[PDB]
Amino acid sequence: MRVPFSWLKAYVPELESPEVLEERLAGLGFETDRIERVFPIPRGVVFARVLEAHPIPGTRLKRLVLDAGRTVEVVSGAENARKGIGVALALPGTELPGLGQKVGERVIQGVRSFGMALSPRELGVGEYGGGLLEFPEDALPPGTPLSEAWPEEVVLDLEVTPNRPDALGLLGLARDLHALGYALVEPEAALKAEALPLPFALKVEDPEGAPHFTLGYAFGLRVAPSPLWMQRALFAAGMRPINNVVDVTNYVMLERAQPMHAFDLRFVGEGIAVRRAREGERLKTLDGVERTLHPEDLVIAGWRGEESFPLGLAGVMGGAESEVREDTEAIALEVACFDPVSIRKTARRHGLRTEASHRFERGVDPLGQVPAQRRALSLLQALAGARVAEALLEAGSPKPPEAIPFRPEYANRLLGTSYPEAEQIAILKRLGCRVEGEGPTYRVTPPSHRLDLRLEEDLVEEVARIQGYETIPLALPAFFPAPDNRGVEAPYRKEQRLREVLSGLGFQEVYTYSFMDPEDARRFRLDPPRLLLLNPLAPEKAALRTHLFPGLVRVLKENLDLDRPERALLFEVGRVFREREETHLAGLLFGEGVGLPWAKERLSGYFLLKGYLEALFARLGLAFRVEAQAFPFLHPGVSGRVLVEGEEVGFLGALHPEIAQELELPPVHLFELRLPLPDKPLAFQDPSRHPAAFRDLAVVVPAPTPYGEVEALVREAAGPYLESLALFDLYQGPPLPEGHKSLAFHLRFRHPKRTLRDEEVEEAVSRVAEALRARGFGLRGLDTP
Amino acid sequence: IPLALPAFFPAPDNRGVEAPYRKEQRLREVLSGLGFQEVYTYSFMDPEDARRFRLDPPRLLLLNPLAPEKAALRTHLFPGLVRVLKENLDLDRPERALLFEVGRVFREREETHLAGLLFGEGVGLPWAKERLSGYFLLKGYLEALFARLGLAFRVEA
Amino acid sequence: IPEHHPARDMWDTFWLTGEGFRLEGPLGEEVEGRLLLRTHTSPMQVRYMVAHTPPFRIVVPGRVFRFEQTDATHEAVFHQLEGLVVGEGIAMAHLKGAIYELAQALFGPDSKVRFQPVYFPFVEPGAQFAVWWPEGGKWLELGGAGMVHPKVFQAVDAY
Amino acid sequence: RVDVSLPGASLFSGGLHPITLMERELVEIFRALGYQAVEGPEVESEFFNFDALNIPEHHPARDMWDTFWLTGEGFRLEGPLGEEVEGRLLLRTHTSPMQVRYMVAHTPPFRIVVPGRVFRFEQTDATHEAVFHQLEGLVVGEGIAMAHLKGAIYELAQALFGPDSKVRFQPVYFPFVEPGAQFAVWWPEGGKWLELGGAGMVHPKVFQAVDAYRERLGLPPAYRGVTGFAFGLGVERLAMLRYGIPDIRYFFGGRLKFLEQFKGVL
Ligand SMILES: N[C@@H](Cc1ccc(Cl)cc1)C(=O)O
Numbered sequence A: 001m002r003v004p005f006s007w008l009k010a011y012v013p014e015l016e017s018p019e020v021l022e023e024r025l026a027g028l029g030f031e032t033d034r035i036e037r038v039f040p041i042p043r044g045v046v047f048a049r050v051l052e053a054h055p056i057p058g059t060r061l062k063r064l065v066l067d068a069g070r071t072v073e074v075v076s077g078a079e080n081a082r083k084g085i086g087v088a089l090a091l092p093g094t095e096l097p098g099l100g101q102k103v104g105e106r107v108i109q110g111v112r113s114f115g116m117a118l119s120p121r122e123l124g125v126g127e128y129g130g131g132l133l134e135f136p137e138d139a140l141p142p143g144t145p146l147s148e149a150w151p152e153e154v155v156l157d158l159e160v161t162p163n164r165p166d167a168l169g170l171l172g173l174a175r176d177l178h179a180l181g182y183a184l185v186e187p188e189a190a191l192k193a194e195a196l197p198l199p200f201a202l203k204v205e206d207p208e209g210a211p212h213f214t215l216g217y218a219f220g221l222r223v224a225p226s227p228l229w230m231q232r233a234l235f236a237a238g239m240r241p242i243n244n245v246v247d248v249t250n251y252v253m254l255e256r257a258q259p260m261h262a263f264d265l266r267f268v269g270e271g272i273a274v275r276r277a278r279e280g281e282r283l284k285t286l287d288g289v290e291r292t293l294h295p296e297d298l299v300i301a302g303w304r305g306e307e308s309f310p311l312g313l314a315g316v317m318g319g320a321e322s323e324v325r326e327d328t329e330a331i332a333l334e335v336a337c338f339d340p341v342s343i344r345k346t347a348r349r350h351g352l353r354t355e356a357s358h359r360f361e362r363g364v365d366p367l368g369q370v371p372a373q374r375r376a377l378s379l380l381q382a383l384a385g386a387r388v389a390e391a392l393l394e395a396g397s398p399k400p401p402e403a404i405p406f407r408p409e410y411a412n413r414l415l416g417t418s419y420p421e422a423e424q425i426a427i428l429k430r431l432g433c434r435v436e437g438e439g440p441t442y443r444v445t446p447p448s449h450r451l452d453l454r455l456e457e458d459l460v461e462e463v464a465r466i467q468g469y470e471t472i473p474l475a476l477p478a479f480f481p482a483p484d485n486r487g488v489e490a491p492y493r494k495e496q497r498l499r500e501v502l503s504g505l506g507f508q509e510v511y512t513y514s515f516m517d518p519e520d521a522r523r524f525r526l527d528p529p530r531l532l533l534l535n536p537l538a539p540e541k542a543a544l545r546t547h548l549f550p551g552l553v554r555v556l557k558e559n560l561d562l563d564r565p566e567r568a569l570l571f572e573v574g575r576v577f578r579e580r581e582e583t584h585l586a587g588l589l590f591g592e593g594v595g596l597p598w599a600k601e602r603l604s605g606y607f608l609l610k611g612y613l614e615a616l617f618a619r620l621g622l623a624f625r626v627e628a629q630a631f632p633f634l635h636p637g638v639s640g641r642v643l644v645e646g647e648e649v650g651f652l653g654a655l656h657p658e659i660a661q662e663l664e665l666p667p668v669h670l671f672e673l674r675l676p677l678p679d680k681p682l683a684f685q686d687p688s689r690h691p692a693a694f695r696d697l698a699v700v701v702p703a704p705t706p707y708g709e710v711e712a713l714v715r716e717a718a719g720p721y722l723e724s725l726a727l728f729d730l731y732q733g734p735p736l737p738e739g740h741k742s743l744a745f746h747l748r749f750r751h752p753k754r755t756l757r758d759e760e761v762e763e764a765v766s767r768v769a770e771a772l773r774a775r776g777f778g779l780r781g782l783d784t785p
Numbered sequence B: 001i002p003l004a005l006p007a008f009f010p011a012p013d014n015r016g017v018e019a020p021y022r023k024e025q026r027l028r029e030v031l032s033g034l035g036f037q038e039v040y041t042y043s044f045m046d047p048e049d050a051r052r053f054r055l056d057p058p059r060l061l062l063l064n065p066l067a068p069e070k071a072a073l074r075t076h077l078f079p080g081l082v083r084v085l086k087e088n089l090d091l092d093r094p095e096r097a098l099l100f101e102v103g104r105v106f107r108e109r110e111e112t113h114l115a116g117l118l119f120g121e122g123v124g125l126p127w128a129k130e131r132l133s134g135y136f137l138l139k140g141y142l143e144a145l146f147a148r149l150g151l152a153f154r155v156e157a
Numbered sequence C: 001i002p003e004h005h006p007a008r009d010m011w012d013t014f015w016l017t018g019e020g021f022r023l024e025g026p027l028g029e030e031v032e033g034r035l036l037l038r039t040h041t042s043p044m045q046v047r048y049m050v051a052h053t054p055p056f057r058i059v060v061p062g063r064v065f066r067f068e069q070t071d072a073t074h075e076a077v078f079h080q081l082e083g084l085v086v087g088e089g090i091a092m093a094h095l096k097g098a099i100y101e102l103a104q105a106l107f108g109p110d111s112k113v114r115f116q117p118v119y120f121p122f123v124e125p126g127a128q129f130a131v132w133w134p135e136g137g138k139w140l141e142l143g144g145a146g147m148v149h150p151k152v153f154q155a156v157d158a159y
Numbered sequence D: 001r002v003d004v005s006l007p008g009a010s011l012f013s014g015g016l017h018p019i020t021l022m023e024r025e026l027v028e029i030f031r032a033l034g035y036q037a038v039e040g041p042e043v044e045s046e047f048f049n050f051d052a053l054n055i056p057e058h059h060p061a062r063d064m065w066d067t068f069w070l071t072g073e074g075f076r077l078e079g080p081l082g083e084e085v086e087g088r089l090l091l092r093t094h095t096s097p098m099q100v101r102y103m104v105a106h107t108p109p110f111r112i113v114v115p116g117r118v119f120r121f122e123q124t125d126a127t128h129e130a131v132f133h134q135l136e137g138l139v140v141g142e143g144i145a146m147a148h149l150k151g152a153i154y155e156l157a158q159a160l161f162g163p164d165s166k167v168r169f170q171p172v173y174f175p176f177v178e179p180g181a182q183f184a185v186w187w188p189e190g191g192k193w194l195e196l197g198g199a200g201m202v203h204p205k206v207f208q209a210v211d212a213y214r215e216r217l218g219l220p221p222a223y224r225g226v227t228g229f230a231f232g233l234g235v236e237r238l239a240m241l242r243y244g245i246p247d248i249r250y251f252f253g254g255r256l257k258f259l260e261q262f263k264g265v266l
């Protein structure tokens, strides 16, 4: 909202300055996003009177004869340029903002234009440049510098939150400032009404949409330009003056968050009808736009005989045809309260956002209509010499606001402040609230203009803001948290350690968007995404990711394209979606590997990751195991599932080649698990003081048999005194029966209480060799040194 | 006596007073995540090890030691690590070992030291043979550490 | 924050579709309602409250989503950090002390906080706070806050 | 084709020492209560380790700590404000001297917890060490009462043993506190009272020592109108109970088969 300092100052006279004002509004709950000085007018621009306009033959230009102290001529192509109005005359030599170059005396189509008459855009008071500024022919003494009646203005760009719709009216703002202590000046609606009948009727066919609807009657209208003070005010507020009547309605709207519209009675017919639009109904709105109404649109219509026709889009924008113009003599004045939701939908439906819709959507004072009619009619009587009728046409009867229980003690308790009771009640009273009773709990009934005041809490915030959030002291609470809140952070802490151990192990964390490209479902060979976006940012982000690895494989490529990493060991923890939302941990390897920069031998690929992963779980004190299993998105040869502490939690392997190719990528290794990982509780295993038994043995098995099964059997059969068991050598070929291989196992034994006798060992090394062959496996070398 | 918890804004000169302690903790944690195993060794020292491990003599001594092997206060952290290594080879028989210890050392002024020790065959494939170990294995692990700590690491002879 | 409410425009929502998805409630139970990507972490203070009892102090970090145009200082996918301290006798003086502590911890002894009234349907009094950044020498608008709204407590207990 | 169940590169897997884990958990417990952790020097002055704490020589109370006395020159023991102090050197017999150092170097109110290696000339058995760890606590400030010490420990217990845990306070003696006390926490599982540590309201003479030393250093008095509580607890005895360690001698034993057992733990 634009807040013109001098305009506001009319209601709040004692305002210190626009800077101090910005400050005061901040504390009241209104933040200004900008402060601008706006009407610099050079001395060269003077007020002039158009004595006569003469069109130049053969041209579409006119020779204006102007009274500017002395008589001067100027040439203008403006459609509104006519005699009888006052204009802004920039004399030769004037530096106008809008052009950059200097104004001068020049010859145009046979006549010497002594400077030129300005448009809002040329004078630089408005963006409008399609016509001359139109002033009252007597606004000033011809030739007087325009500045002398149009000083510069400072305008605050104020943010008005939805809860304070009353603040969409300058007087509403004035009231808040008043609560702070400033004297408040409310305009007096000096009206001289006439008891006589209104030549039209009101028929509100849809009270849902038009809960409270009034109509004023003003006739004997002398439509003309607005006084200089109003044009200045309107311009500063972002609006453009049109004339007497139209301006008065914008002025009052801007003054008290109450949109109103004057309908030329020529088009009203027998009466105004507030109804829903009949499907197909057409309406050329004020913006010159020809539209088609939806049956859900509230419309201000008129009727004549057996015909009903639309006059305006109720609460959004009036019709083009009934717009008040120079030849208008009487009007029907609409001042109402519309159903916010209705206005909201209609506004959207037609892509219209107006000063009016905006205020009705946010809500209007349910009982402000009648006071608004006086203000407007009064102004119309003063500026358009209107003869106003005494009666109004009213439909609807809103109920006043109810009383709210208020306890000064609670206010102070909730805030942690200690404002004396009297101080509080006074504040409330300044805000226009009525306070009854004598405590401890009062009956506080708010002004109908405050839609935001319904609860006691609502009142304590009123006390706080007027006292000032800075008067609330600082403190820290002390208390024993309720029992069910203990260790409630364990989960969060658990995942954090995980990320931290990973970063310490060597993995680099990466954040990837939670979105997904529906196609990647096909690309990376995954089941289709279960959740989709009704309104995606793009179709490549139309679904919600089901896996974490696809985003990682992508970032890899993108990193190879921008920079050219030789290697990369990444990881990412993120929420994934499918059936249920779940947290996943995924990692990706790639590149040459680990080794010596100047050397050649290296460690990489599957077993590099598998090794890094072994350390991770080793560090987490959890069992890690990788059994072979197929996965669409994995290489058939390099593929297996993950078994943390027995249960399957995810997968590990090389990215399937075909995918690698479609994506133009080298072999990429990776994994993806489901969090949280299992928890293996500690069970301290007191070490043995005694020496351990060392014995080796190779197991001959066919190349196809998985290392896992062999190891499993060997351990399972090694007995309850097995300490270690490690593969220190894998071999296959001559002299073994090809299609076979030997597994070099280092074995250890130890007894907690005493040492082990060779009987127990050599026998246990047999309990294995037994089931080892009984299972179909050899023994290249038993009791090997 | 009832139970209660105090509330108050701590005096200004107490802010971030824990930074130091927190800093060393991260260090230990990153180390354990990089692969190092933490070890605690007695702050005492055997006066002879001064000669054994070729170190200047210990500056602080005990007027009443638990034993003469614990009669001085350690000047270095590595001697205790080299020892624990042997003792570990004697009880159990570790093939490898990547250790670390953070501790207060004494000499002129009491100072905090970080020491690490490598040993064994190294990194590679259990069933294979090619391996990464010795100097450049440590030097490499150490490079990662500082890489992780975002600090310049360099080793001049 | 009801529909067609002017206040609901403060959050541009990403609406989701598709079936078979099981959204689970606070007490692990299977709830319903139109799915969407959370526009802020706030809903979590409702979930937590129906699942625990006061007094307590929680902070909930989290990825949030909003349909918006991505520029140099604007994202559609970012992170928030909520705070919620409920308990008998808790006052706005405590909210102010918390943020004061936040600032000190974040910018040093020469830092300071500032509170201005602002609107949020879930708090009353409502507020926006800024912290003084001595180095860059300027007020950074950090976040909004306020005393939990009566209707929020009622929603929790009703559920 | 690859035997994916085949062992991978033998990258080393690290681990943290039992005491580190225990100390960490303890420090976290108190951080949540607004305590900040700071440390002190292992080699101390008799002044900080004893005198400043109201424990003079030939005093029967000084027998509560069997001191390791040090000798040798060239050693620079630095005081609280970085200055070069004097006094008979010794290995601190408890972390307590640190609450004096911290107090002369800062101003109230505040909350600190100070972990640390301590030394005592004693015979090493299965549940006794000459070299162990303590965790001190010190909360000073205007209006601080014994009701707060009791609440702190109550919180310590809950955090350490669950909702069915409970604390117990009995009067006990310490030259640096008055009232003085010993506290035990209820361990639901093992179903028994574990005597954790001693505590009490800082002693008037300790505050006086601090301010006197401050004057001597040019600083203004800061502990004239404040009270405070402190506490101290043995770490190993708790780590053992918690991790189920049978012999306290393991901690400094350096045995890998032992240490490696704590990689998982957090
Ligand atoms: N540090 C003391 C224990 C202690 C007692 C009382 C307090 Cl207040 C603090 C700590 C000792 O070594 O026995």
Ligand SMILES: [Mn+2]
Pocket (backbone or CB within 6 Å): A163, A452, A458, A461, A462, C124
């Ligand atoms: Mn309010």
